[PDB]
Amino acid sequence: PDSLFFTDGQRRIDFILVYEDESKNEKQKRKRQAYESNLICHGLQLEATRSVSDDKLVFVKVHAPWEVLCYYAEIMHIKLPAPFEKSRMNDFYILDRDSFFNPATRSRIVYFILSRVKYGINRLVSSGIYKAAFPLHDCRFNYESEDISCPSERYLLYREWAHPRSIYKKQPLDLIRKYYGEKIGIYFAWLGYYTQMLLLAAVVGVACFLYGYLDQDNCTWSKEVCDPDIGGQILMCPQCDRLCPFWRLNITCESSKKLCIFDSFGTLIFAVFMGVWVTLFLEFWKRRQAELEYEWDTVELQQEEQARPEYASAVFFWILLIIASVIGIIVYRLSVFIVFSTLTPQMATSITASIISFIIIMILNTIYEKVAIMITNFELPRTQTDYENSLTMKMFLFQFVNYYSSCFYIAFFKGKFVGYPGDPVYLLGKYRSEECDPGGCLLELTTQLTIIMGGKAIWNNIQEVLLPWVMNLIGRYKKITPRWEQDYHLQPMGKLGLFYEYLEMIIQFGFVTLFVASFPLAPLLALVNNILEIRVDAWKLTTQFRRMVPEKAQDIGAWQPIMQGIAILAVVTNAMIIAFTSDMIPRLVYYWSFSIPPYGDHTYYTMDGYINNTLSVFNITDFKNTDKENPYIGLGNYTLCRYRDFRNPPGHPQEYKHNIYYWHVIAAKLAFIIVMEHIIYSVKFFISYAIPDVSKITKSKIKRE
Amino acid sequence: FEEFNGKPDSLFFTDGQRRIDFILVYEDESKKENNKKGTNEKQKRKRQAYESNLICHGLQLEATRSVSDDKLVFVKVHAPWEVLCYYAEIMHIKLPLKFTAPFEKSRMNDFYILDRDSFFNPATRSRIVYFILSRVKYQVMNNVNKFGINRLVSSGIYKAAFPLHDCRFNYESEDISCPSERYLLYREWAHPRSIYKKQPLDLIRKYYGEKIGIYFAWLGYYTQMLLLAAVVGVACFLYGYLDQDNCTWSKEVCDPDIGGQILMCPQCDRLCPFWRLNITCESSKKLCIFDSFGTLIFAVFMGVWVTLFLEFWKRRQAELEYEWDTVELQQEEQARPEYEAQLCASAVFFWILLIIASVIGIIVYRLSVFIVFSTTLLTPQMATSITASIISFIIIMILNTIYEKVAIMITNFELPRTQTDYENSLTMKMFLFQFVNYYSSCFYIAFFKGKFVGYPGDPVYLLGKYRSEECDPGGCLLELTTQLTIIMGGKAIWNNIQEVLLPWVMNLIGRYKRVSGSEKITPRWEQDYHLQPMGKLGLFYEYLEMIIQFGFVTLFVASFPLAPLLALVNNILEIRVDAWKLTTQFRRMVPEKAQDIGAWQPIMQGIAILAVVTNAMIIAFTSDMIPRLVYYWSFSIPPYGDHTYYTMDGYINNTLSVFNITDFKNTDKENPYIGLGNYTLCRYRDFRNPPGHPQEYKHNIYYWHVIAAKLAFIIVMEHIIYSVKFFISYAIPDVSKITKSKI
Ligand SMILES: *[C@@H]1O[C@H](CO)[C@@H](O)[C@H](O)[C@H]1NC(C)=O
Ligand SMILES: [Ca+2]
Ligand SMILES: [Ca+2]
Ligand SMILES: [Ca+2]
């Protein structure tokens, strides 16, 4: 009959026990009998029905009597289904005595009852005393509940909020929490608001990108890089020793023209904007958190102590952090190296290197997860919440290093401290430092960033959950068993599913916020991913997993400190990216200072001759201070070559030393860093303190009541 | 009512069994008043209604006629138990137990009740009676209720209302039973004869309540931390002083063969001539004293010290909050709308006034220096600096009162809803005004003095005819130190003298207006009526002065390592000064309770945050350590220098720039130099290319090297300091472990 009620009886099930009979080594049967007798004596109903499919598997079900169940529910601080008390029985309207309770809360109370009893959930499940135990879903998600009394909340919830037919509709948070629990509701609300503000971020980013894209005609330095009589005549020095010849500058028109898009004033404006956008996001999330705290029953008290089966060396963890970061850097370096040792060509090279690095990161993620689990379990935590917090911190640190090591290397430690061709830097010995092209490494930073974000999102939840949908779409266009057996045939979601989902969104937030300067279109990718992910998570949760007992929570949890830390780090990261990764500061300094008769020869500020007047000069006769075999020998009548660094020309009294322009530029860079950081922090503080002038609605009405 | 009994010190009713709690003082109609007898009718009717309501509510009260003046009538008060217990229950007043609750009659037997009248301390009785007096209503006119004892005095119905002191501070109470605890407080706490013994905060709380005990405990903890700071600062200064044989650049400046030959270049237009660098040997030695690595050590030590002070203060606050069992009363909070009450324009106008205040401060300092220099024609230069600082401080003190008055008027235009709103608005506005007024000159000296003046060929004028002033080769750090020490010391001395004197002289005037030959013994209430009132603001000005002192100690310590010693002397005097003025020259303030110091806490956190920026900027720009280090590490070497190994030798000569006298352009005042015709080139403090050269007088490589070093130092210092402070805040539990046990 696929009913939710006891056999031939009016009694609503709330939780199921399934055990494997040993009668087809009696210790397991003895433990089972003891547990069952204890449950019977403690005042719970029990009924067993054998599944037709497997005679070995025998299922057991329970119920909830009003008196004892309500008493134990009042045992802990439970509000209206304001601790429960018969003295306020008629204060609140009640239409019936058998259904007024929320079935989710009934399941939660029964689960707590089972947890408190001892002798079994943990030990019996782990050791095989009981195969599994879970509550029931209202009905099949395909078709409405056959029983009229059932509201078929699962059917409506699926059809309205899980199927991608409702991709555009609004999020029904009330049903989400009233069916699943407070944790799921708060997670989905946070995800929704995050998408909402990602919309504004995406609009602003698109505006800036268009502003850049319409400036291609007025991008002087790229034009000069292309004009053959200027770009082609420049002969750059080789970037390696034994496998690179002298190259003309104009071979990088495509790179420079693309780079002028992501290296314009629009990016600077967008970085400044995101600086305050992050603060606004935090402030309004506190708004919404207060609002949900008021509107929902989020005033549940916390128990002082909890029990766990397990009831410094932290330096070892940080050593693992260091080795992980070093491994990531070596992985990226080796990937680019192997792709090298073998219009599009350089772009395809960069894309392939990024793809290989992303693959290696994907493999490394599982290993890092396993080692984090092992090490944290070796610590013997006292409780469960502390266990989750320790996992959050350690897992997040591993993911952070594993995913951002290559990006940090590209941004900062690539082409920054390479000496002039006369005395190259071999920091470790026989390991030369890589150099960026004259434009900079910003373009490959953007390529790595976009490839990683895309690949991760697309491959992960997206692709894993999405095969059947595309299969059915292509197909279209181009024995009856009770509910408990069906739910048994499902698979559980474990105890870390919500943790993993939050981890994914937090990694996405880090990608969007940290390196926003390089890639102004990142918010658009994040928005698309979120719009799909909300429905993917909803569908998987409501279709492919057993029902989870609702829990009580008031905030996302351990992540808010991580969010604010990410914001405080992101401001400085963006400042450093604009200062060092990009070549906007040298360009501005040249335009304002070195185009004037004292140093230049133009009658007015202009960008003409920036490329020629910026690149340095090197002499072959001074090939090396070590005076060994040199790659400069022969190879034509070449006598002078140029390199991307600010040093005095040969013959100057300060031979091959940093010149005035270098120090002017570095001073400008440091001034920009300090001014931008101070202004952004000041605005952050003002906005945070302006809660009364920003947030007069939510707190006022929440305190009014 | 009934006449004077004959026992002066007695604080009881004429029977001797009822303890007084308040004295209401009104002016009778017995005289021949003028204007309206109707005004007298209304005043007497209102007074009668209020007294009738109070006597109905359950408070006894009997009056008496003053012996000296016939027109003075004193009205006593008294609260029997029943009303006392009921109102304590309404107030959530807790009593000593022996899992904690306020006082209720239902649990009357559950408390350690000692005696009829003794179980309740007089301070709490006074507070309860004060609330009873405040909440009551007396009449309704224009269909709108009129209530509040405060309004009666505001409109002039009552002269005053106050509790009573135990007995004379300088003699014991004639009544044996009386504790005379005022006597003990005077003997031990006030009366600087006990300058050293630790102040008994418990008795202070008992007598004057928590509102005063919190302030005095804060001051004591402040003083101890200043002892630590003064020891460390004296150590740093002593090291700087004993290390002078190795201050090379000062030796070069003083040396007649190096410094003497440097023919510097005139600063002014034509009122000051050429001069030789060796005339600044005294200033060079002073800067060696004040501008050593000890200054950096003290800057970083103070950066840590401010945070440590804040955290330990939080721990002490928690400890005291538990010890004085203020949790339930702190939770029980209710605010009453102001008795006086019945856009962004106010804020913007306030900000404009702030800007003009800053400009006025800068201008007054500049004019003081200018006039002290003009009047010219034991070092003459230092004498001039001291004089300038003296006039600057005089003008600052004069302008402080005007700024206080303007703040009061501005905050009065806006109508804060309750007393707390008014107090917080006043706190913010007064702090901003005092900050700007006191520190505008110091900020100018530190950051805007001799920083954007061009080379002599093309002098920089701010807006015309106003040439920018510039420092000597060493810098203006010594000028800043002189300004700071003079202003801080003068503020301390003048403020302490004013605090000690003004109430005393007012009391003396009042007494000399009553030289009537009483030659008798007079009652307690009548004698306590003559003391000063301690206007409703209260400890606001005390907190303000202490906050300004802390700002001086912390913000600018990078230029004056001896500031904590001056602060220590000031505070060890101020403890007893404030105690004496509060115990011997003022009527008993009504007790209350407070969570913390008040609105000042955000001010202190802001000051601590901005101190790091101020110190970093001072060391980077005001001082000259950074150019010295740059020269030592990167310009005494073959690429630019000549010395084989790093050294400070030849720093003065190799740094001072050059200028060719005939190269003066511009048509106005063509003859600032050519008059003498002695030489053809002068040296000035700036990094620019020498004559000739493709870029004649543009900034050279050394300038940009130095600027980059300065900015890098700022970044590194700010980041490390803030990171260390954040980590320290995270690590400190912020509550005592013992208190964690007790709670
Ligand atoms: C670069 O310049 C050289 C000579 O100026 C030339 O012939 C070539 O076509 C230009 N473009 C590329 C992509 O090499
Ligand atoms: Ca997912
Ligand atoms: Ca004082
Ligand atoms: Ca004082």
Distance from CA of A316 to the nearest CA of B (A): 21
Whether residues A670 and B715 touch (CB distance < 8 A) is answered with: yes
Whether residues B711 and A667 touch (CB distance < 8 A) is answered with: yes
DSSP states along A69-94: HHHHHHHS---------GGGTTTS--
Residues of chain A in contact with residue B698, where contact means CB-CB under 8 angstroms, are: 598
Helices and strands, number each (H, E), in chain A: 25, 8
Q: What count of Cα atoms within 13 Å lies in the side-chain half-sphere of residue B705? A: 19
* Token representation of residue A579: 């200062």
**Cross-strand bridge partners of residue A545:** A491
DSSP states along B267-329: SSSSSS---BGGGGHHHHHHHHHHSSHHHHHHHHHHHHHHHHHHHHHHHHHHHHHHHTT-HHH
* Index of the ligand 1 atom closest to the CA of residue A233: 5
CB A558 within 8 A of CB A387: no
SS3 track for A214-235: CCCCCCHHHHHHHCHHHHCCCE
- CA distances, A79 to each of A73, A75, A92 (Å): 9, 11, 12
As a dihedral over the C-alpha atoms of residue A116, residue A118, residue A120, residue A125, rounded to 10 degrees, the angle is: 90
* Token representation of residue A594: 């070195």
* Token representation of residue B124: 């709490």
A568, A576, A664, A684: which to substitute to probe chain B, counting the most B Cβ within 10 Å?
Answer: A664
Could you tell me which of A394, A529, A398, A517 has the C-alpha nearest to residue A452?
A529
For residues A85 and A415, what is the distance between their CA atoms, to the nearest angstrom?
71
* Token representation of residue A283: 């402030």
Could you tell me which of A247, A230, A238 has the C-alpha nearest to residue A620?
A238
B681 secondary structure, DSSP code: E
A674, A678, A685: which to substitute to probe chain B, counting the most B Cβ within 10 Å?
Answer: A674
* Token representation of residue A695: 């947030």
What are the residues whose beta carbons fall under 8 Å from the beta carbon of B73, sequence distance 6 or more? Answer: B1, B25, B26, B27, B28, B63, B64, B65, B66
Whether residues B712 and A599 touch (CB distance < 8 A) is answered with: no
Provide residues of B within 8 Å CB-CB of chain A: 639-640, 694-695, 698, 700-701, 704-705, 707-708, 711-712, 714-715
What are the residues whose beta carbons fall under 8 Å from the beta carbon of A341, sequence distance 6 or more? Answer: A243
Could you tell me which of B32, B28, B40, B33 has the C-alpha nearest to residue B65?
B28
Torsion sign over Cα B639, B643, B646, B647: negative
Tell me, what amino acid is at B186?
A: Y
Tell me, what amino acid is at A160?
A: E
Q: Radius of gyration over alpha carbons of chain A, in Å?
A: 32
Of B639, B695, B700, the CB nearest to A654: B639
SS3 of A607, please? coil
* Index of the ligand 1 atom closest to the CA of residue A253: 13
For residues B417 and B338, what is the distance between their CA atoms, to the nearest angstrom?
6
Whether residues B711 and A659 touch (CB distance < 8 A) is answered with: no
What are the residues whose beta carbons fall under 8 Å from the beta carbon of A258, sequence distance 6 or more? Answer: A443
Helix axes B281-290 and B380-413, enclosed angle (nearest 10): 50
CB A548 within 8 A of CB A438: no
What are the residues whose beta carbons fall under 8 Å from the beta carbon of B291, sequence distance 6 or more? Answer: B474, B475, B477, B623, B624, B625
For residues B733 and B315, what is the distance between their CA atoms, to the nearest angstrom?
9
Residues of chain B in contact with residue A668, where contact means CB-CB under 8 angstroms, are: none
Of A657, A664, A673, the CB nearest to B704: A664
Residues of chain B in contact with residue A671, where contact means CB-CB under 8 angstroms, are: 711
Q: Radius of gyration over alpha carbons of chain B, in Å?
A: 33
SS3 of A51, please? coil
Instruction: Give distance in angstroms: CA of B547 to centre of ligand 3.
Output: 11
Q: Please tell me the total number of residues recorded for chain B in this structure.
A: 743
The reply, when asked if residue A444 is annotated as ligand binding, is no
- Strand (E) or helix (H) holding A16: strand A16-20
**Cross-strand bridge partners of residue B24:** B75, B161
Ligand nearest to the CA of A250: 1
For ligand 1, mutation pick of A248, A252, A254, A256 (most atoms within 8 Å of CB):
A248
Instruction: Give distance in angstroms: CA of B299 to centre of ligand 3.
Output: 26
Residues of chain A in contact with residue B715, where contact means CB-CB under 8 angstroms, are: 670, 673-674
Torsion sign over Cα B304, B307, B308, B309: positive
For residues B22 and B162, what is the distance between their CA atoms, to the nearest angstrom?
6
Taking the CB of residue B93, how many other CB atoms lie within 10 A of it?
19
Distance from CA of B125 to the nearest CA of A (A): 34
Of A598, A659, A670, the CB nearest to B698: A598
What are the residues whose beta carbons fall under 8 Å from the beta carbon of B518, sequence distance 6 or more? Answer: B67, B68
Tell me, what amino acid is at B256?
A: P
Q: What count of Cα atoms within 13 Å lies in the side-chain half-sphere of residue B257? A: 1
What lines the ligand 1 site, CB under 6 Å? A 228, 232, 248, 250-251
**Pairing status of strand B72-75 against strand B63-65:** antiparallel
As a dihedral over the C-alpha atoms of residue A586, residue A590, residue A592, residue A597, rounded to 10 degrees, the angle is: 160
Of all residues in chain B, the one with the smallest CA distance to A677 is B715
- Strand (E) or helix (H) holding A20: strand A16-20
Taking the CB of residue A410, how many other CB atoms lie within 10 A of it?
27
SS3 of B595, please? coil
> Across chain B, which distance is largest between two alpha carbons, in Å?
103
Distance from CA of B739 to the nearest CA of A (A): 19
Provide residues of A within 8 Å CB-CB of chain B: 598-599, 654, 657, 659-660, 663-664, 666-667, 670-671, 673-674
What are the residues whose beta carbons fall under 8 Å from the beta carbon of A229, sequence distance 6 or more? Answer: none
The conformational region for residue A242 under phi > 0 = left, psi -120 to 50 = alpha, else beta, is alpha
For residues A630 and B86, what is the distance between their CA atoms, to the nearest angstrom?
100
Residues of chain A in contact with residue B704, where contact means CB-CB under 8 angstroms, are: 660, 663-664, 667
Helix axes B81-91 and B122-135, enclosed angle (nearest 10): 80
The conformational region for residue B231 under phi > 0 = left, psi -120 to 50 = alpha, else beta, is alpha
Torsion sign over Cα A401, A406, A407, A412: positive
How far is residue B571 CA from its own chain's centroid? 11
Helix axes B600-617 and B701-731, enclosed angle (nearest 10): 150
How far is residue B445 CA from its own chain's centroid? 22
Whether residues A674 and B715 touch (CB distance < 8 A) is answered with: yes
For residues B567 and B496, what is the distance between their CA atoms, to the nearest angstrom?
13
Q: Where are the beta strands (DSSP E) in B52-198?
A: 63-65, 72-75, 137-141, 144-147, 158-162
- Strand (E) or helix (H) holding B429: helix B419-443
- Determine whether B180 is exposed, middle or buried from the number of CB atoms within 10 Å of its CB (0-12, 13-18, 19+): buried
Name the resolution in angstroms.
3.2
Whether residues A666 and B695 touch (CB distance < 8 A) is answered with: no
For residues B255 and A284, what is the distance between their CA atoms, to the nearest angstrom?
66
A460 secondary structure, DSSP code: I
For residues B309 and B218, what is the distance between their CA atoms, to the nearest angstrom?
11
Whether residues A670 and B711 touch (CB distance < 8 A) is answered with: yes
Residues of chain A in contact with residue B640, where contact means CB-CB under 8 angstroms, are: 654
Query: By alpha-carbon position, which residue is closest to atom 14 of ligand 1?
Result: A251
Whether residues B715 and A673 touch (CB distance < 8 A) is answered with: yes
DSSP states along B4-66: --S-TT--B-TTS-SB---EEEEE-S-S---S-HHHHHHHHHHHHHHHHHHHHHT-B--EEE-
DSSP states along A94-137: -S-SSSSS-HHHHHHHHHHHHHH-----HHHHHHTSSSEEE---
* Token representation of residue B437: 């007024």
B557 secondary structure, DSSP code: G
What helix, strand, coil percent values describe chain B, rounded to 5? 55, 5, 35
CB A16 within 8 A of CB A487: yes
For residues B463 and B171, what is the distance between their CA atoms, to the nearest angstrom?
67
Instruction: Give distance in angstroms: CA of B577 to centre of ligand 3.
Output: 8
For residues A639 and B68, what is the distance between their CA atoms, to the nearest angstrom?
113
Of A598, A659, A666, the CB nearest to B708: A666
DSSP states along A257-277: HHHHHHSSHHHHHHHHHHHHH
For residues B452 and B494, what is the distance between their CA atoms, to the nearest angstrom?
36
Taking the CB of residue A535, how many other CB atoms lie within 10 A of it?
18
DSSP states along B360-401: HHHHHHHHHHHHHHHT----HHHHHHHHHHHHHHHHHHHHHH
A412 secondary structure, DSSP code: T
Residues of chain B in contact with residue A691, where contact means CB-CB under 8 angstroms, are: none
> Across chain A, which distance is largest between two alpha carbons, in Å?
103
What are the residues whose beta carbons fall under 8 Å from the beta carbon of A30, sequence distance 6 or more? Answer: none
Torsion sign over Cα B304, B306, B310, B312: positive
For residues B159 and B72, what is the distance between their CA atoms, to the nearest angstrom?
10
Distance from CA of A702 to the nearest CA of B (A): 19
A641 secondary structure, DSSP code: E
Residues of chain A in contact with residue B603, where contact means CB-CB under 8 angstroms, are: none
Of B639, B714, B715, the CB nearest to A657: B639
* Index of the ligand 1 atom closest to the CA of residue A229: 5
For residues A477 and A461, what is the distance between their CA atoms, to the nearest angstrom?
25
Distance from CA of A683 to the nearest CA of B (A): 15
- Specify the long-range contacts of residues B254-261, CB closer than 8 Å, at least 24 apart: B254/B278, B254/B281, B254/B284, B254/B285, B258/B652, B258/B653, B259/B652
Cβ-Cβ pairs closer than 8 A, A with B, add up to: 31
Tell me, what amino acid is at A636?
A: G
The conformational region for residue A661 under phi > 0 = left, psi -120 to 50 = alpha, else beta, is alpha
Whether residues B708 and A659 touch (CB distance < 8 A) is answered with: no
- Determine whether B525 is exposed, middle or buried from the number of CB atoms within 10 Å of its CB (0-12, 13-18, 19+): buried
B196 secondary structure, DSSP code: S
**Phi, then psi, of B161 in degrees rounded to 5:** -155, 130
Distance from CA of B611 to the nearest CA of A (A): 14
For residues B556 and B563, what is the distance between their CA atoms, to the nearest angstrom?
9
For residues A288 and A702, what is the distance between their CA atoms, to the nearest angstrom?
11
